[PDB]
């Protein structure tokens, strides 16, 4: 693994994924960067590589294969390179355009998971994508099986921009003074102050990727989650700008709820994606009450975070939550969960989240749809056969849980002995 | 319709708040508003169900003097103005009131009339209890959802401080931030301001703690997103803990103290005060409902967590709540006017009823009333005797029009083994 730029060298037998025009060009022997990360990262990452390779080999008869290229970040970069996040790692991802990473440990004294943030910002990975699916595991939601969503979250603005000042700082006092004198606005002297920005530019690019995802996956509904009745010029504007870019650039593929009832017989015109919106609080209540009415959810930073987390709790998949941050022609997949130190190196951790992150990177972003299908099948199969790691064996009395390595081997056996005839029913290209 | 045109009805001995405690007679005056939309109906049902319950649990040594007030459409037709100055001070005097959902005043300067009301009386605490009444729910653990959300309802994102992206005001603050604070905001971005004060946080937390002590709650959880908004949500959390240890030391313990000074188990005689990142909190009421009771949060988070919990127990339509200030409180349902059901004798009145119960049984100390009100509602559910809103989820069950359902609850209240309903 590389510590410097000159050391950057994609492994033998692979070709770089390319981004020309507005499309990703994926060779059959694509170089894909991977970062082991910290805590359970190495374990779950190595599990993901094995499961995906078996998946790739199985569905494409060996004509395709990933050439994994290791890059370093976290404890392994500190140990080998003397630093947590070498420039060479960021340059490497930008070169490969696609990478799988394990969770990273947050440097003491820095802003939350700052390393993930530094990576996302350096590569302009503005879209956070969190799919939430049910794999048959025990869940607290009676309608867990009816939860099949994907959250497209704007990941650069909102209160996450970090614009805020302590209540007793001179800056805050200055801002309070400016607000009263210039706008006659009164804010208590003992109030902390935060600023919430939402832009047309960030909203449009996010909505566009979401609409493209919908077309790619054949989704029939895209929902804008916002609290526009309270925050009119931030969240309301977000909703407004998202609707606009939809009609402006996807006019022939979309229809709003208004147009559905108005211009049509209140019925769905086939081939058209319904683009609607829901006030955030109502949205939370509806995924709980009628999850089947929702598929793709578009939201600004904070609402996106809350809605995807709640959804994962409903399907019993908090620990299996997969994710990916995408920019233009570039993406980095990673599980939602952290480094889980209490399980690090014990061969006990559930690798599903990291595996599904890989599946998300290769099956969706890279287009190898069949890979995703065979992977989700193997997982759903393992859960049904109760061949799972201890976290899932919680609601399975009598079940002898599997170690990480054994769960990996179990998924690979389901992949190899799988009947593609039906497993790949209506998905190909 | 005016300040002088209204006066306390005969027999009512106005509820009075003095010193550090409320004081209510046995014939108190409790203001009330029919509101509008399905309001009139629901408020009606609430009135009778309450009295019935009141006469049953107290034999007859107690009664409420319902003093009517106007707001909404039934004030626009008699007073000319939606919210008459009387209806407000008529509440400030009564100290306690019940109301239906008012209509959104199109063309005015307010989001809703409830805002003007709460702002006028300084009802800074939005209290939403969430309980399961046996109805069909999406949550496998609906029955384990028994919480009350104390939501700061005057600050945060709800203060309405924001500016359109293309407004000259936006441009001024944008240039002000970049120049004096090196902060650059995109020219095409709307800008909102989020304020969280020590003052507002403290009084909300104190009200929550007193509520816990008064009602025997053993857990008070602070919901915040302090890892992202350190100076607003994070400060909110720090200030909540701060006033807890400062004015309720003897009655509370932190999770850290539980671990270091106890075998990792909460001392039974003390209230556990802990905190949960907003995301974790949303997940936890879904995964471990039974580990939470009283939830304290800023305006937005409080709105979200209470709304989610209500959906879990299948009680979206019957979510009750009240706004409380210093010695004064106005209770009402969360749901709106729902015009599509106005005057059609169909809307579920449980929310309005549960609001009165929250007002009389909780705020006014008449606990017995709450006990029997909930007993009846749960009895109705465990008998398929409910309005259409819930019937649609019960195979074969016939929708008992609002009126029918109202009588059923009262019928259950009259005939009841009070000696066992209470324990």
TrEMBL record, chain B:
It comes from Aeropyrum pernix (strain ATCC 700893 / DSM 11879 / JCM 9820 / NBRC 100138 / K1). GO terms for biological process: glyoxylate cycle; tricarboxylic acid cycle. Its EC number is 1.1.1.42. The modification N6-succinyllysine is found at residue 99. PROSITE patterns: IDH_IMDH (PS00470). NADP(+) 2 binds at residues 104, 227, 284, 332, 336-338, 340-341, 348, 389. NADP(+) 1 binds at residues 102, 104, 114, 332, 335, 337-338, 348, 389, 392. This is isocitrate dehydrogenase (NADP(+)). NADP(+) binds at residues 335-341, 348, 392. Disulfide bonds join 1-79. Mg(2+) binds at residue 303. D-threo-isocitrate 1 binds at residues 104, 112, 114, 118, 128, 151, 158, 225, 279. Its cofactor is Mn(2+); Mg(2+). Homodimer. D-threo-isocitrate 2 binds at residues 128, 151, 225, 227, 279. Keywords: Calcium, Glyoxylate bypass, Magnesium, Manganese, Metal-binding, NADP, Nucleotide-binding, Oxidoreductase, Tricarboxylic acid cycle. Residues 29-409 form the Isopropylmalate dehydrogenase-like domain. Belongs to the isocitrate and isopropylmalate dehydrogenases family. It catalyses: D-threo-isocitrate + NADP(+) = 2-oxoglutarate + CO2 + NADPH. The record marks 158, 225 as: Critical for catalysis. D-threo-isocitrate binds at residues 112, 114, 118, 128, 151. The modification N6-acetyllysine is found at residue 140. Ca(2+) binds at residues 279, 303, 307. InterPro entries: IsoCit/isopropylmalate_DH_CS, Isocitrate_DH_NADP_dimer_prok, IsoPropMal-DH-like_dom. The modification Phosphoserine is found at residue 112. Binds 1 Mg(2+) or Mn(2+) ion per subunit.
